[PDB]
Every structure is written in C-alpha cells, then in structure tokens.
Coordinates of N, CA, C and O in Angstrom, one line a residue:
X1 N -24.3 102.2 124.6 CA -22.9 102.0 124.1 C -22.2 103.3 123.9 O -22.9 104.3 123.5
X2 N -20.9 103.4 124.2 CA -20.2 104.6 124.0 C -19.1 104.3 122.9 O -18.1 103.6 123.2
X3 N -19.4 104.6 121.7 CA -18.5 104.3 120.5 C -17.2 105.1 120.7 O -17.1 106.1 121.3
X4 N -16.2 104.6 120.0 CA -14.9 105.3 120.0 C -15.0 106.2 118.7 O -15.7 105.8 117.8
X5 N -14.3 107.3 118.7 CA -14.4 108.2 117.6 C -14.4 107.5 116.2 O -15.4 107.5 115.5
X6 N -13.3 106.9 115.8 CA -13.2 106.3 114.5 C -14.2 105.1 114.3 O -14.7 104.9 113.1
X7 N -14.6 104.5 115.4 CA -15.6 103.4 115.3 C -16.9 104.0 114.9 O -17.7 103.4 114.1
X8 N -17.3 105.2 115.4 CA -18.5 105.9 115.1 C -18.5 106.3 113.6 O -19.4 106.0 112.8
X9 N -17.3 106.8 113.1 CA -17.1 107.2 111.8 C -17.3 106.1 110.7 O -18.0 106.4 109.7
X10 N -16.9 104.9 111.0 CA -17.1 103.8 110.0 C -18.5 103.2 110.1 O -19.1 102.8 109.1
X11 N -19.1 103.2 111.3 CA -20.5 102.8 111.5 C -21.4 103.7 110.8 O -22.4 103.3 110.2
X12 N -21.1 105.0 110.9 CA -22.0 106.0 110.2 C -21.8 105.9 108.7 O -22.7 105.9 107.9
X13 N -20.5 105.7 108.2 CA -20.3 105.6 106.8 C -20.9 104.4 106.2 O -21.4 104.4 105.0
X14 N -20.9 103.3 106.9 CA -21.5 102.0 106.5 C -23.0 102.1 106.4 O -23.7 101.5 105.6
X15 N -23.6 103.0 107.3 CA -25.0 103.2 107.3 C -25.6 104.2 106.2 O -26.7 104.5 106.2
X16 N -24.7 104.6 105.3 CA -25.0 105.5 104.3 C -25.2 107.0 104.6 O -25.9 107.7 103.9
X17 N -24.5 107.5 105.6 CA -24.5 108.9 106.0 C -23.6 109.8 105.3 O -23.8 111.0 105.2
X18 N -22.5 109.3 104.8 CA -21.5 110.2 104.1 C -22.1 110.9 103.0 O -22.4 110.3 101.9
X19 N -22.3 112.2 103.2 CA -22.9 113.0 102.1 C -24.4 113.0 102.0 O -25.0 113.6 101.1
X20 N -25.1 112.4 103.0 CA -26.5 112.3 102.9 C -27.1 113.7 103.0 O -26.9 114.4 103.9
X21 N -27.8 114.0 101.9 CA -28.4 115.3 101.7 C -27.4 116.4 101.7 O -27.6 117.5 102.3
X22 N -26.2 116.1 101.1 CA -25.1 117.1 101.1 C -24.3 117.2 102.4 O -23.4 118.1 102.5
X23 N -24.7 116.5 103.4 CA -24.0 116.5 104.7 C -22.9 115.5 104.9 O -23.1 114.3 105.0
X24 N -21.7 116.0 104.9 CA -20.5 115.2 105.1 C -20.4 114.4 106.4 O -21.0 114.8 107.4
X25 N -19.7 113.3 106.4 CA -19.5 112.4 107.6 C -18.9 113.2 108.8 O -19.2 112.8 109.9
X26 N -18.0 114.1 108.5 CA -17.4 114.9 109.5 C -18.4 115.7 110.3 O -18.3 116.0 111.5
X27 N -19.4 116.2 109.5 CA -20.5 117.0 110.1 C -21.3 116.2 111.0 O -21.7 116.6 112.1
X28 N -21.7 115.0 110.6 CA -22.5 114.0 111.4 C -21.7 113.7 112.6 O -22.3 113.6 113.7
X29 N -20.4 113.5 112.5 CA -19.5 113.1 113.6 C -19.5 114.3 114.6 O -19.6 114.0 115.8
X30 N -19.2 115.5 114.2 CA -19.1 116.6 115.1 C -20.4 116.7 115.9 O -20.4 116.9 117.1
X31 N -21.6 116.5 115.2 CA -22.9 116.5 115.8 C -23.0 115.5 117.0 O -23.5 115.8 118.1
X32 N -22.7 114.2 116.7 CA -22.8 113.2 117.7 C -21.8 113.3 118.8 O -22.0 112.9 120.0
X33 N -20.6 113.9 118.6 CA -19.5 114.1 119.6 C -20.1 115.1 120.6 O -19.9 114.9 121.8
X34 N -20.7 116.2 120.1 CA -21.2 117.2 121.0 C -22.6 116.9 121.5 O -22.9 117.3 122.6
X35 N -23.4 116.1 120.8 CA -24.7 115.8 121.3 C -24.7 114.8 122.4 O -25.4 114.9 123.4
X36 N -23.8 113.8 122.3 CA -23.8 112.7 123.3 C -22.4 112.2 123.7 O -22.4 111.4 124.6
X37 N -21.4 112.6 123.0 CA -20.1 112.1 123.3 C -20.0 110.7 122.7 O -19.3 109.8 123.3
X38 N -20.8 110.4 121.7 CA -20.9 109.1 121.0 C -21.5 108.0 122.0 O -21.2 106.8 121.9
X39 N -22.5 108.4 122.8 CA -23.1 107.5 123.7 C -24.6 107.3 123.3 O -25.4 108.3 123.3
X40 N -24.9 106.1 123.0 CA -26.3 105.8 122.5 C -27.4 105.8 123.5 O -28.6 105.8 123.2
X41 N -27.1 105.7 124.8 CA -28.1 105.7 125.9 C -28.2 107.1 126.6 O -28.9 107.2 127.6
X42 N -27.6 108.1 125.9 CA -27.6 109.4 126.4 C -29.1 109.9 126.3 O -29.8 109.6 125.3
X43 N -29.5 110.7 127.3 CA -30.8 111.3 127.3 C -30.8 112.6 128.1 O -30.0 112.8 129.0
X44 N -31.7 113.5 127.6 CA -31.8 114.8 128.2 C -33.2 115.2 128.3 O -34.0 115.2 127.4
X45 N -33.7 115.4 129.6 CA -35.1 115.7 129.8 C -35.2 117.2 129.8 O -34.4 117.9 130.4
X46 N -36.2 117.8 129.1 CA -36.5 119.2 129.0 C -37.7 119.4 129.8 O -38.8 119.2 129.3
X47 N -37.5 119.9 131.0 CA -38.6 120.2 131.9 C -39.5 121.3 131.4 O -40.6 121.4 131.7
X48 N -38.8 122.2 130.6 CA -39.5 123.4 130.0 C -40.7 123.0 129.2 O -41.7 123.7 129.2
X49 N -40.6 121.9 128.4 CA -41.7 121.5 127.6 C -42.0 120.0 127.6 O -42.6 119.4 126.7
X50 N -41.5 119.3 128.7 CA -41.7 117.9 128.9 C -41.4 117.0 127.8 O -42.2 116.1 127.4
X51 N -40.2 117.1 127.1 CA -39.9 116.2 126.1 C -38.5 115.7 126.5 O -37.9 116.1 127.5
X52 N -38.0 114.7 125.7 CA -36.7 114.1 126.0 C -35.9 113.9 124.8 O -36.4 113.6 123.7
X53 N -34.6 114.2 124.9 CA -33.6 114.0 123.8 C -33.1 112.5 123.9 O -32.7 112.2 125.0
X54 N -33.1 111.8 122.9 CA -32.6 110.4 122.9 C -31.5 110.0 122.0 O -31.4 110.4 120.8
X55 N -30.6 109.1 122.6 CA -29.5 108.5 121.8 C -28.3 109.3 121.4 O -28.1 110.5 121.9
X56 N -27.6 108.7 120.5 CA -26.3 109.3 120.0 C -26.5 110.7 119.3 O -25.6 111.5 119.4
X57 N -27.7 110.9 118.8 CA -28.0 112.2 118.1 C -28.9 113.1 118.9 O -29.3 114.2 118.5
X58 N -29.2 112.7 120.2 CA -30.2 113.4 121.0 C -31.4 113.9 120.3 O -31.8 115.1 120.3
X59 N -32.1 112.9 119.7 CA -33.3 113.3 118.9 C -34.5 113.5 119.9 O -34.7 112.8 120.9
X60 N -35.3 114.5 119.6 CA -36.5 114.9 120.4 C -37.8 114.2 120.3 O -38.4 114.2 119.2
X61 N -38.4 113.9 121.4 CA -39.7 113.2 121.5 C -40.9 114.0 121.0 O -42.0 113.4 120.8
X62 N -40.8 115.3 120.9 CA -41.9 116.1 120.4 C -42.3 115.9 118.9 O -43.4 116.0 118.5
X63 N -41.2 115.7 118.1 CA -41.4 115.6 116.7 C -41.0 114.3 116.0 O -41.7 113.8 115.1
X64 N -40.0 113.7 116.5 CA -39.4 112.5 115.9 C -39.7 111.0 116.3 O -39.8 110.1 115.5
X65 N -39.9 110.8 117.6 CA -40.2 109.5 118.1 C -41.3 109.6 119.2 O -41.5 110.6 119.9
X66 N -42.0 108.5 119.4 CA -43.1 108.4 120.4 C -42.6 107.8 121.7 O -42.2 106.6 121.6
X67 N -42.7 108.5 122.8 CA -42.4 108.0 124.1 C -43.6 107.9 125.0 O -43.5 107.5 126.2
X68 N -44.8 108.1 124.5 CA -46.0 108.1 125.2 C -46.3 109.2 126.2 O -47.4 109.4 126.6
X69 N -45.2 109.9 126.7 CA -45.4 111.0 127.7 C -45.3 112.4 127.3 O -45.4 113.3 128.1
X70 N -45.0 112.7 126.0 CA -44.8 114.1 125.6 C -46.2 114.7 125.1 O -46.7 114.3 124.1
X71 N -46.7 115.8 125.8 CA -47.9 116.4 125.4 C -48.0 116.9 124.0 O -47.2 117.7 123.5
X72 N -49.0 116.4 123.2 CA -49.2 116.8 121.9 C -48.0 116.7 121.0 O -47.7 117.6 120.2
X73 N -47.3 115.6 121.1 CA -46.1 115.3 120.3 C -46.5 114.5 119.1 O -47.6 114.0 118.9
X74 N -45.6 114.4 118.2 CA -45.7 113.6 116.9 C -44.6 112.6 116.9 O -43.7 112.5 117.7
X75 N -44.7 111.7 115.9 CA -43.8 110.6 115.7 C -43.4 110.5 114.2 O -43.7 109.6 113.5
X76 N -42.7 111.6 113.7 CA -42.4 111.7 112.3 C -41.4 110.6 111.8 O -41.4 110.3 110.6
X77 N -40.7 109.9 112.8 CA -39.8 108.8 112.3 C -40.5 107.5 112.5 O -40.0 106.5 112.0
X78 N -41.7 107.5 113.0 CA -42.5 106.3 113.2 C -41.8 105.2 113.9 O -41.8 104.0 113.6
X79 N -41.1 105.6 115.0 CA -40.3 104.7 115.9 C -40.7 105.1 117.3 O -41.0 106.3 117.6
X80 N -40.5 104.2 118.2 CA -40.7 104.4 119.7 C -39.3 105.0 120.0 O -38.3 104.6 119.4
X81 N -39.3 105.9 121.0 CA -38.1 106.5 121.4 C -37.1 105.4 121.9 O -35.9 105.7 122.0
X82 N -37.6 104.3 122.3 CA -36.8 103.2 122.7 C -35.8 102.8 121.6 O -34.6 102.5 121.9
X83 N -36.3 102.8 120.4 CA -35.4 102.4 119.2 C -34.1 103.3 119.2 O -33.1 102.8 118.8
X84 N -34.2 104.5 119.7 CA -33.1 105.5 119.7 C -32.1 105.3 120.9 O -31.2 106.0 121.0
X85 N -32.3 104.2 121.7 CA -31.4 103.9 122.8 C -30.7 102.6 122.6 O -30.2 102.0 123.6
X86 N -30.7 102.1 121.4 CA -30.1 100.8 121.1 C -28.6 100.9 120.9 O -28.1 102.0 120.7
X87 N -27.8 99.9 121.1 CA -26.3 99.9 120.8 C -26.2 100.0 119.3 O -25.2 100.6 118.8
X88 N -27.1 99.3 118.6 CA -27.1 99.4 117.2 C -27.7 100.6 116.7 O -28.9 100.9 117.1
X89 N -27.1 101.4 115.9 CA -27.6 102.7 115.6 C -28.4 102.9 114.3 O -28.7 104.0 113.9
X90 N -28.7 101.8 113.6 CA -29.5 101.8 112.4 C -30.8 102.6 112.4 O -31.1 103.5 111.6
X91 N -31.6 102.4 113.5 CA -32.8 103.1 113.7 C -32.6 104.6 113.9 O -33.4 105.5 113.4
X92 N -31.6 105.0 114.7 CA -31.3 106.4 115.0 C -30.9 107.1 113.7 O -31.2 108.3 113.6
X93 N -30.1 106.5 112.9 CA -29.5 107.0 111.7 C -30.7 107.2 110.7 O -30.7 108.2 109.9
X94 N -31.6 106.3 110.7 CA -32.8 106.3 109.8 C -33.6 107.6 110.2 O -34.1 108.3 109.3
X95 N -33.7 107.8 111.5 CA -34.5 108.9 112.1 C -33.7 110.3 111.8 O -34.4 111.2 111.4
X96 N -32.4 110.3 112.0 CA -31.6 111.5 111.7 C -31.7 111.9 110.2 O -31.8 113.0 109.9
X97 N -31.7 110.9 109.3 CA -31.9 111.1 107.9 C -33.2 111.8 107.6 O -33.4 112.6 106.7
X98 N -34.3 111.3 108.3 CA -35.6 111.8 108.2 C -35.6 113.3 108.6 O -36.2 114.2 107.9
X99 N -35.0 113.6 109.7 CA -34.9 115.0 110.3 C -34.3 115.9 109.2 O -34.8 116.9 108.9
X100 N -33.1 115.5 108.6 CA -32.5 116.3 107.6 C -33.2 116.4 106.3 O -32.8 117.0 105.4
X101 N -34.4 115.7 106.2 CA -35.1 115.7 104.9 C -36.0 116.9 104.9 O -36.7 117.2 103.9
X102 N -36.1 117.6 106.1 CA -36.9 118.8 106.2 C -36.0 120.0 105.8 O -34.8 119.9 105.7
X103 N -36.7 121.2 105.7 CA -36.0 122.5 105.3 C -34.7 122.8 105.9 O -33.7 123.1 105.1
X104 N -34.6 122.8 107.2 CA -33.3 123.1 107.9 C -32.2 122.2 107.6 O -31.0 122.6 107.7
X105 N -32.5 120.9 107.2 CA -31.4 120.0 107.0 C -30.7 119.7 108.3 O -31.4 119.6 109.3
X106 N -29.4 119.7 108.3 CA -28.6 119.5 109.5 C -28.7 120.6 110.5 O -28.5 120.4 111.7
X107 N -29.1 121.8 110.1 CA -29.3 122.9 111.0 C -30.3 122.6 112.1 O -30.4 123.3 113.0
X108 N -31.0 121.5 111.9 CA -32.1 121.1 112.8 C -31.6 121.1 114.3 O -32.3 121.5 115.2
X109 N -30.3 120.6 114.5 CA -29.7 120.6 115.8 C -29.0 121.9 116.1 O -28.0 122.2 115.4
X110 N -29.4 122.5 117.2 CA -28.7 123.8 117.6 C -27.2 123.5 118.0 O -26.4 124.4 117.9
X111 N -26.9 122.3 118.5 CA -25.5 122.0 118.9 C -24.6 122.1 117.6 O -23.5 122.5 117.7
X112 N -25.1 121.6 116.5 CA -24.3 121.6 115.3 C -24.0 123.0 114.9 O -22.8 123.4 114.6
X113 N -25.0 123.9 114.9 CA -24.8 125.3 114.6 C -23.8 125.9 115.6 O -22.9 126.6 115.1
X114 N -24.0 125.6 116.9 CA -23.1 126.1 117.9 C -21.6 125.7 117.8 O -20.7 126.5 118.1
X115 N -21.3 124.5 117.5 CA -20.0 124.0 117.5 C -19.5 123.2 116.3 O -18.4 122.6 116.3
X116 N -20.2 123.2 115.2 CA -19.9 122.4 114.0 C -19.9 123.3 112.7 O -19.1 123.2 111.8
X117 N -20.9 124.2 112.6 CA -21.1 125.1 111.5 C -19.9 126.0 111.4 O -19.5 126.6 112.4
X118 N -19.5 126.2 110.1 CA -18.4 127.1 109.8 C -17.1 126.8 110.7 O -16.4 127.8 111.0
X119 N -16.9 125.6 111.1 CA -15.8 125.2 111.9 C -14.9 124.2 111.1 O -15.3 123.7 110.1
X120 N -13.7 123.9 111.7 CA -12.8 122.9 111.1 C -13.2 121.6 111.7 O -12.9 121.3 112.9
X121 N -14.0 120.8 110.9 CA -14.4 119.5 111.4 C -13.7 118.3 110.9 O -14.0 117.1 111.2
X122 N -12.6 118.5 110.1 CA -11.8 117.4 109.6 C -11.3 116.5 110.7 O -11.2 115.3 110.5
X123 N -10.9 117.1 111.8 CA -10.3 116.4 112.9 C -11.2 115.2 113.4 O -10.6 114.3 114.0
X124 N -12.5 115.2 113.2 CA -13.4 114.2 113.6 C -13.2 112.9 112.8 O -13.4 111.8 113.4
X125 N -12.8 113.0 111.6 CA -12.7 111.8 110.8 C -11.2 111.4 110.5 O -10.9 110.4 109.9
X126 N -10.3 112.3 110.9 CA -8.8 112.1 110.7 C -8.3 110.7 111.3 O -8.4 110.5 112.5
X127 N -7.8 109.9 110.3 CA -7.3 108.6 110.7 C -8.3 107.5 110.8 O -7.9 106.3 111.1
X128 N -9.6 107.7 110.6 CA -10.6 106.7 110.7 C -10.8 105.8 109.5 O -11.6 104.9 109.5
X129 N -10.1 106.1 108.4 CA -10.2 105.4 107.1 C -11.6 105.5 106.5 O -12.1 104.5 105.9
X130 N -12.1 106.7 106.5 CA -13.4 107.0 105.8 C -13.3 108.1 104.8 O -12.2 108.5 104.4

C-alpha cells in the first residue's frame, strides 16, 4: 500500500508513535517518506551482505525480522519479515519502536540522519490534523 502523506501521519499517531522515546511524529514521517515514499511493500536487497530492507520503514533482515535467508541474522522484533510488508502497519510500527529502544534511538536509520536530522520537518505533518 502507498499511503498518502496525511494518511500516514494519522495512522502513525493512532499507533502511538507521536513522541515515542522522545521522537516526534514529524521525525517518523520524514523517515518513512525517504525510506519508502510511504510504500509498505517497498524492499531493498543489499547484495553486499545479503540482507533485505522491508516495508514502510525499510527495516533490515539482519537484526530485526527473520526472512530465513540472511546469513547469521537475528530476529529482535520476533516477526517474520513478511509482517513488514502488510498494508496494515501495526507490526512494522511495533518493530520500529523496538529499534528505537536501543542506544541510537531514531539515529538507527542512516536516511533519517541524511535528510531528517537537524532539518525543518514540520512540513511533513502540516495540515494532517495531528
């Protein structure tokens, strides 16, 4: 599913993301906009280390979800990577919250650092009623 900007913002707010671990909704939005363009079936294969990024947040198979094919990977979210390709994003959000429960927090994603950190992200939630 390819969510519309404001549609993503309310779905994320409803799922308890606004301010989760000090991370604002605009920050989560900027991340999903750059990670997948708000597309839940987005995927990126990393031939360099044979892992795959899944869903709206492009979560990686090496640490967060089990896809059966990543060498010496773990499943810290205790979910099959299939759960991260659903139109319903509850499972992906649960996994993303788990990710930010570690030291780096939202810094976990290099895209966020690249185009969300120290940036004007208000534009992402402007007019969405959140």
